[PDB]
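Batch manifest line 258
LIGAND: 5-mercapto-2-nitro-benzoic acid
JOB: complex structure
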Amino acid sequence: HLTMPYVMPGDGEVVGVGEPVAIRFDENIADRGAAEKAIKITTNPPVEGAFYWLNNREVRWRPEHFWKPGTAVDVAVNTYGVDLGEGMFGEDNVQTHFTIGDEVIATADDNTKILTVRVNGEVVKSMPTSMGKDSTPTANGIYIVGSRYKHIIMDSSTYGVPVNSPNGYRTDVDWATQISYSGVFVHSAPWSVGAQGHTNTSHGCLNVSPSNAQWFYDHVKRGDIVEVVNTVGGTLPGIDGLGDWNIPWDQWRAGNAK
Ligand SMILES: *Sc1ccc([N+](=O)[O-])c(C(=O)O)c1
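JOB STATUS: finished
ARTIFACT:
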């Protein structure tokens, strides 16, 4: 009858302008109002924000617009002993303190097949890209940068197919930056450099050259933004995990505690 809260981002971290505050409990929360009342978020410079639940275990808090660089954020999760409903009580308190770094916004336009990275407003890279093919398109929308991997094996088991079976495969991938929980990454794709800037060839990921992928890995951080426009796909769900900014402010602010 105890549930532990876990808070992101990490204490002392510098994050990008799109990073939400996240509180994820290890059990489903029956009384969302009780949980929200127990979480106190302070910012400097002061800016208003609000809570929205992505599912029964995890609540997010963010402002209306992307954070101002330099903002310092204190999060007090004062859940110890709090009745979170159906006889579940908060097992402990948590806190975190973080700051916002440079504004880093990369825009991938399917009309041009270019991924343009802007750092504090300056165009710093114009990367040819190859996105998802028509049958497996990359969704449009605002994506938040998550984890980064120098090397990762992307294999067929992600789509339910065993690696050693006739249609199985496993691919060594370098410089992979996650931008959705649905499985979209910006990564090195040496095999498709000819297509990048011209044709979409992937299962949904943003293929770029080895040089550009390493640059992206080295210069982006958790909470930075990738925006995809003009693809034949739909829109990234607001509840993806890294899709929070796709929910309009009035819906987000109104919340879903009840
Ligand atoms: S989204 C994504 C990235 C890389 C690879 N890969 O196999 O190199 C895939 C895939 O085809 O499974 C998907």
